[PDB]
C-alpha cells in the first residue's frame, strides 16, 4: 500500500541525524539536482538556500560538523502533494561539543519514482532559535 507518512518520517529522521553525526560529508546523498537546503546562518541576516548535491555537499562542510549530537524531542509527518511527506522536527543540536541549541526543521520528501519505498529530500529548512529570538 502507499507507505505511512509518519513511518517514513521517523525513519528518514533517525537515518538523517545518524549520518549527520557519523558521515556528515555524505549528507548530500539525501538530495537531488533541484533540492533546496538551508541549515541556519547569519550573513548579518538569516542565510539563503543552495540547490542540488554539489552546492549542498559544499555548505555542509562550510559548517565544520564534528562529533555532532542531537536529541530529537518531536517529529510530525503527514501525506502531502504527489505522495510526498512533509516532516516537522523539533530538537536540540550540539556541534564540536559546544552549546546544545534548540532548532525548528521542515523537510519535504518526494518519492524517487523508480524503486518503491525510495525517497529523496526535495527541501530542507533548518533554523537555530537563538538566531531568531535574540
Amino acid at each position: 500500500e502507499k507507505p505511512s507518512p509518519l513511518l517514513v518520517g521517523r525513519e528518514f529522521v533517525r537515518q538523517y541525524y545518524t549520518l549527520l553525526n557519523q558521515a556528515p560529508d555524505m549528507l548530500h546523498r539525501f538530495y537531488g539536482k533541484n533540492s533546496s537546503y538551508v541549515h541556519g546562518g547569519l550573513d548579518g541576516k538569516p542565510a539563503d538556500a543552495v540547490y542540488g548535491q554539489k552546492e549542498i555537499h559544499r555548505k555542509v562542510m562550510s559548517q565544520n560538523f564534528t562529533n555532532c549530537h542531537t536529541k530529537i524531542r518531536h517529529v510530525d509527518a503527514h501525506a502531502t502533494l504527489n505522495d510526498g511527506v512533509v516532516v516537522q522536527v523539533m530538537g536540540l543540536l550540539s556541534n564540536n561539543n559546544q552549546a546544545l541549541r534548540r532548532f525548528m526543521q521542515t523537510f519535504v520528501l518526494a518519492p524517487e519514482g523508480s524503486v518503491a519505498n525510495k525517497f529523496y529530500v526535495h527541501n530542507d529548512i533548518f533554523r537555530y532559535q537563538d538566531e531568531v529570538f535574540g
Partner: peptide, 18 residues
C-alpha cells in the same frame, strides 16, 4: 553505520559529484 543506516525506506541517492 552501514548496518545502522539500513531501514524500511531508502533515502540515499547516487553521489552526483564529478
Amino acid at each position: 553505520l552501514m548496518a545502522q543506516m539500513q531501514g524500511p525506506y531508502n533515502f540515499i541517492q547516487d553521489s552526483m559529484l564529478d
